[PDB]
Structure formats: C-alpha cells, structure tokens
Amino acid sequence: MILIKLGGSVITDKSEYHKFNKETVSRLADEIRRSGQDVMVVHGAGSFGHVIAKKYAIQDGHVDDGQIPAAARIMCDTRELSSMVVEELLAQGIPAVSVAPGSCFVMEDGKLIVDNEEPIRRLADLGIMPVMFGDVVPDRKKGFAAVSGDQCMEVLCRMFDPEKVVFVSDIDGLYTADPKTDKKARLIGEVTREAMLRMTDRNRRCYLVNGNAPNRLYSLLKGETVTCTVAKGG
Amino acid sequence: PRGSHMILIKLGGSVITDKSEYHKFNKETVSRLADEIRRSGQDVMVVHGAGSFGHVIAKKYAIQDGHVDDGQIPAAARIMCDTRELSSMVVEELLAQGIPAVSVAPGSCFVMEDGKLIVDNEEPIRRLADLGIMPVMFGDVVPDRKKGFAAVSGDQCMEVLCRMFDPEKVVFVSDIDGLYTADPKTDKKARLIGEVTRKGVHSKMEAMLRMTDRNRRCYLVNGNAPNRLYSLLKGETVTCTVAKGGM
Ligand SMILES: Nc1ncnc2c1ncn2[C@@H]1O[C@H](COP(=O)(O)OP(=O)(O)O)[C@@H](O)[C@H]1O
Numbered sequence A: 001m002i003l004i005k006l007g008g009s010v011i012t013d014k015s016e017y018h019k020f021n022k023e024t025v026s027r028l029a030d031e032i033r034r035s036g037q038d039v040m041v042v043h044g045a046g047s048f049g050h051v052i053a054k055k056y057a058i059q060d061g062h063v064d065d066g067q068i069p070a071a072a073r074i075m076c077d078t079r080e081l082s083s084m085v086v087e088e089l090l091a092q093g094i095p096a097v098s099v100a101p102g103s104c105f106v107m108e109d110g111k112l113i114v115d116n117e118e119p120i121r122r123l124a125d126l127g128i129m130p131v132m133f134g135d136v137v138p139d140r141k142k143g144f145a146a147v148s149g150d151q152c153m154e155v156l157c158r159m160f161d162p163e164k165v166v167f168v169s170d171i172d173g174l175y176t177a178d179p180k181t182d183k184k185a186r187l188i189g190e191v192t193r194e195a196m197l198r199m200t201d202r203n204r205r206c207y208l209v210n211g212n213a214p215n216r217l218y219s220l221l222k223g224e225t226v227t228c229t230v231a232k233g234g
Numbered sequence B: 001p002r003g004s005h006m007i008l009i010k011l012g013g014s015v016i017t018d019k020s021e022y023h024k025f026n027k028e029t030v031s032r033l034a035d036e037i038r039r040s041g042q043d044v045m046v047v048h049g050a051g052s053f054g055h056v057i058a059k060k061y062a063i064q065d066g067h068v069d070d071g072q073i074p075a076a077a078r079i080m081c082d083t084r085e086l087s088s089m090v091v092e093e094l095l096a097q098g099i100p101a102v103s104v105a106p107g108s109c110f111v112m113e114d115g116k117l118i119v120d121n122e123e124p125i126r127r128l129a130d131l132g133i134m135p136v137m138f139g140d141v142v143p144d145r146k147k148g149f150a151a152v153s154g155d156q157c158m159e160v161l162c163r164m165f166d167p168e169k170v171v172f173v174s175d176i177d178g179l180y181t182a183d184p185k186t187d188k189k190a191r192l193i194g195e196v197t198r199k200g201v202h203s204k205m206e207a208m209l210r211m212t213d214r215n216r217r218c219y220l221v222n223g224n225a226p227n228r229l230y231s232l233l234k235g236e237t238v239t240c241t242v243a244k245g246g247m
C-alpha cells in the first residue's frame, strides 16, 4: 500500500479562497489509476481552510465566541473540497469516501486522537478508500484545534503500515530555503540529517514529488526514478 | 444531560430533495425551513434524509441487501458522496441563517449491526454541540459488522441522538400534514390521526411513541406548508400529528 497526500498547494489555489484545481486533481487521479497500485489518498485544505483560519486566528483555539461561525465555515469548506476530490477519484474507478477528522476524532496537545479505528478499517476492507483531510477538530483543552494533512498521514501510517509514503506538492522537492522567494536554493536529494523522518523505517521511504509535473506521480508510483526528495532513516 | 431545551428536527428527504429526479436539491424549501428555524430562536439539532441523493442508486444496486457482489462497491461510494454533497447544501443553508453547523456523516465514523446503528464514540458529537457547531447526521451507507455495508435512515439517526441528549421536543418534517390511516397520495378516503397515544400504520404510530415520555412529545409536521414549522417551534398549534404519553 502507498499512502499519498494531495497537498493543498496543487489541489487548490492557496492564494484564491475556495478555488479548486479541477484539472490538476483530475490528472492526478488519472495518474493514480494508471499506476495500478493499492493506494490511500489524503489531501490538504489549502485555501478551503487556511484563508479563513488566519483571519479568525483558528490556530489559537477557542479564544472568543466570534470564531464559532468561522470554524463551522471552515468545516463546511473542507468537507466541500473533499467531495470534489472524491468526485475525481470516483470518475477514475477509485471508490472512496470523505472521512472528516472534525466529525469523528478529537485533538489534545496538538495530536489527533483516534479512539475508534473500526469504521475506518471497515471502509478500507470494503474497497471504499477512507479519505481524511485537514480540518478543524474539537480540542479537549482548547475547544477546537486545526489538524493538517501531514498528521493525517502520520495517523494513517501507524494504522495501516504502508509500503511507501508520497507527499504531493507544488514543488519539485525540499530546498535549502523557499524556492519561490530564494531562487538560489538547491534541490536536496536525500533526507537523513520536516516530519518525513517520523514515518520511515528500514524499508519504508518517504517521497516529496511535484504534482504540477504531469506523469511524475505516475512514474513515482510505478517504481521509476523521478525528480523528488527521498527520506530515509529510523 | 445538557440539552434540556433542545428540539430535535428531521428535514426529511421528501421535502428537502425532489425524489422524482436523481441528485436534485430543493433550494427554496431548505432556505425557507432554515429561516423558519432561525426565526423560532429555539436551540435545535437538525437531521436530514437523503431522498433522491441515495434512494435512487440504493434501489438500483440493492444496497439494502448488503455486500453481495463487488459491483455495488462503486455504487455505495457514489451514494456516500451524494449524501455528503447533499449535507453540504443543507449546512450551507444553515450557515446562511447564522446557525453554525457541521456535517457528521454516520458512514464515516459509525458502524451498523443487523439494522442497528452503533455509536461507540460519543465524544466528537457531544463536543461539537457544546462548542456551538450543531452536528448534523443523515441517512448514509454505513459499514456493517456482518453484511459489509448497510443503510442507515434519517429516522434511525434521530433515535440515537434522542437517547444521547434527551431533547425536550422532537419534530419530523415531511411532505405530509401528518400520519394518516393510509397513503394520502393513494387513498383519497384515508383520515388524519391527530394524536398518537394508545393503539403499516401500526409500526408508524409505534415509532413516534418510542421517542416520547411524560414531557417530550413527537410531532410530524408538513414542511411544504410555509410558516408551519416556525409556528410549532414557538409553541403554536398547527396541522400535525402529535405523540404523547410515552411507553
Ligand atoms: N526549504 C523549502 N523547500 C521547498 N519549499 C519550501 C521551503 N521552504 C518553504 N517552502 C514553501 O512551502 C510550500 C509547500 O508547502 P505547502 O504548500 O504548505 O504544502 P501542502 O502541499 O501541504 O500545501 C512551497 O510552495 C514553498 O514555497
């Protein structure tokens, strides 16, 4: 099994609120289907969550009552975005269903707690891929807290033990600095010296590939070599 | 428990969707129903059905029969996507009326067993309601502990939330003035049952009293009639079917 995260940087326009990149997700879902590999797809929120959370300081928790309608607005936006991603997967013959973390799990000390793993495992047993995503989750100490797609990878990595982990973003890989502001940073090949090291072991290798490059995710899922950042270690 | 003055409402699929055409959302009804809910000012928790967003495909692929062949797996995932997309449109109407709510799909967090919806983890639903974000459940394809997948109903989703929060009132919004002795669209001779107390109209009368006691009552009001849902929530008496007494 290969755990993939369709990051918000490719599936959405992180600078334009509520903007869905339909042609990108449609191509990425087609590349996943053409690879023929058993996968579990996660995706981020992008502008379907980050734009409103920053305006209302959702990352700070339940500060005042003015954040309650904004938190529900983000929750509705993330669930709406997941429907569009699932629609692209269903059109490519990939049964999947949206699993909102804010509707089934809780958060505490910055971690997503999965007290009941049965329905998620039963969904994967039916061939209907459970699709978690970045969302606002009820917090046990801060009222509510935001979970990212990265932690959803960490939770699903320890639960299903995938053979490979893939992070899909709008960058060819990890650089020494921001490649959009610093145009001198080099592409870092290996990683042994982010959180890609917490989901790798003896054989599991984490990858960071550019979803904006066509057929790059397809070749990476097929075992061929592509431009990316590979992580290894314990 | 906590919701001492809560009113439990079902926006049935016959009034929020057009069950004659697949994947059709009644925009003006849900917008009017949500506005009627807001104008009442009562603390409420909304559940809705699937209607044409689930019944059309479930009948064609026999989802009620369970996982018999692999051909129903893409059909089940399509129903789950349709019910989630419909729940977004309902929540989108509640957010416009100033009522913070979030979709809580049962098929993505719960399991079923021989027709019974199992809710082992009550923390997320209880935490959302306490925060002010109304958890919204609905009919959906739910993984079954024996039959692969099963179909949960909006009526069944209310039975879980009624025993979870112990609400003060229960309202069932449908496309009918109330419970009749027969089908009102077929039997032009059937009469309306005003009060349901002591005795498939037998199973329908028995289902309403299961969510009633000495104080809490169950109502079956018409959602296609404007201002009818708003009048009941404030305490006015309208054309409906009330269940009182409990069991
Ligand atoms: N050292 C770095 N290497 C690569 N990208 C970086 C680096 N530092 C900052 N970035 C920025 O982070 C962005 C990718 O992260 P992000 O878009 O948040 O991931 P996600 O796909 O989860 O949205 C890139 O657009 C890039 O501009």
Ligand SMILES: Nc1ncnc2c1ncn2[C@@H]1O[C@H](COP(=O)(O)OP(=O)(O)O)[C@@H](O)[C@H]1O
Residues within 6 Å of the ligand: B011, B012, B013, B014, B015, B049, B154, B173, B174, B175, B176, B178, B179, B180, B181, B182, B183, B184, B185, B186, B200, B201, B204
């Ligand atoms: N005894 C009865 N009394 C009232 N309506 C009935 C009866 N038997 C069948 N019906 C039919 O059931 C329909 C509503 O049921 P349904 O749409 O399943 O409820 P909901 O959509 O709220 O789940 C009505 O259109 C009505 O014609």
Ligand SMILES: CCCC/C(C)=C/COP(=O)(O)OP(=O)(O)O
Residues within 6 Å of the ligand: A006, A007, A008, A009, A014, A043, A044, A045, A046, A047, A049, A050, A053, A058, A059, A133, A134, A135, A136, A146, A147, A148, A149, A150
């Ligand atoms: C305080 C954040 C609130 C917004 C939110 C739910 C974000 C999801 O996290 P995430 O998956 O990393 O988004 P993205 O990096 O893929 O765009």
Ligand SMILES: CCCC/C(C)=C/COP(=O)(O)O
Residues within 6 Å of the ligand: B012, B013, B014, B048, B049, B050, B051, B054, B055, B058, B063, B079, B139, B140, B141, B142, B150, B151, B152, B153, B154, B155
């Ligand atoms: C899961 C299969 C689809 C049928 C369904 C959702 C029935 C329950 O909806 P409803 O009767 O409107 O409450």
